[PDB]
Amino acid sequence: DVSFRLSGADPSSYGMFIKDLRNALPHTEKVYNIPLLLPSVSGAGRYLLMHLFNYDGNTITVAVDVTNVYIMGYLALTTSYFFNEPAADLASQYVFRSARRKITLPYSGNYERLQIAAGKPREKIPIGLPALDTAISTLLHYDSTAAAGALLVLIQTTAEAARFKYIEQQIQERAYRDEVPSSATISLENSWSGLSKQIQLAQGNNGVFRTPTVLVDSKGNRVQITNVTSNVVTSNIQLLLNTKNI
Numbered sequence: 001d002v003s004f005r006l007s008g009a010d011p012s013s014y015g016m017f018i019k020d021l022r023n024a025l026p027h028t029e030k031v032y033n034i035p036l037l038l039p040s041v042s043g044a045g046r047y048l049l050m051h052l053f054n055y056d057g058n059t060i061t062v063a064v065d066v067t068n069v070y071i072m073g074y075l076a077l078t079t080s081y082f083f084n085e086p087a088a089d090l091a092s093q094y095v096f097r098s099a100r101r102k103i104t105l106p107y108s109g110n111y112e113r114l115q116i117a118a119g120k121p122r123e124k125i126p127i128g129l130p131a132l133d134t135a136i137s138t139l140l141h142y143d144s145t146a147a148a149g150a151l152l153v154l155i156q157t158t159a160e161a162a163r164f165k166y167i168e169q170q171i172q173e174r175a176y177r178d179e180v181p182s183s184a185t186i187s188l189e190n191s192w193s194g195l196s197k198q199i200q201l202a203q204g205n206n207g208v209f210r211t212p213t214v215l216v217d218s219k220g221n222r223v224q225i226t227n228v229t230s231n232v233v234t235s236n237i238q239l240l241l242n243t244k245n246i
């Protein structure tokens with residue numbers, strides 16, 4: 001368990017939640033000083049439970065695969081909800097078995113299918129701590145269209161912030177006012193797998209990527225990352241997806 005309370009939340013307590021989230025993910029090595037997530041984990045140890053409390057103190061518990069930071073499903077009162085995909089179905093064998101009923105959401109967890117279900121891309125969905133409080137409250141009342149948008153908010157404010165310090169900082173800036181994610185934020189989210197792969201390939205290649213990774217920077221400009229000396233590698237990314245899962 002890691003925990004976050006929106007009641008009384010500020011940039012510091014959110015920082016501590018994101019720190020806790022990162023520290024709960026097991027790893028045996030660092031690659032260029034960045035934790036390398038495990039190739040796999042067998043049984044219930046695969047999944048971390050995040051306890052989130054909205055402002056009024058209602059709670060959901062979110063199940064996260066510790067090898068890839070993917071949200072598999074969540075529990076809200078006595079009802080469990082899982083994405084419609086095999087990994088989630090497998091997770092439902094291990095978490096929230098005490099739920100009185102289990103609902104399978106009518107989409108998978110990937111951004112493309114979530115955006116379809118929600119009626120909108122995530123460029124247009126404001127994120128922040130208030131949006132996170134809203135998302136928690138939404139997931140309490142099954143509505144599958146509303147839940148898709150809530151889940152885009154949740155994934156970005158939790159998993160994506162764990163992966164990148166820049167995104168954590170973006171959410172901290174939106175502690176008391178939501179705002180659509182920066183282009184750079186979207187870019188990083190979409191590049192995580194690729195960055196993770198190229199950082200791993202750079203080991204044995206003198207710190208140079210085999211294939212450059214294109215990102216958008218904080219001013220809106222398209223930039224190529226070619227090696228591990230980039231600030232994206234030294235001072236941004238916090239977790240690497242294992243190339244075994246790429």
Ligand SMILES: *[C@@H]1O[C@H](CO)[C@@H](O)[C@H](O)[C@H]1NC(C)=O
Nearest residue numbers: 208225226227228229230231
């Ligand atoms: C790698 O990227 C840096 C930016 O960090 C750039 O200035 C430099 O020319 C590149 N160095 C190598 C060894 O490719």
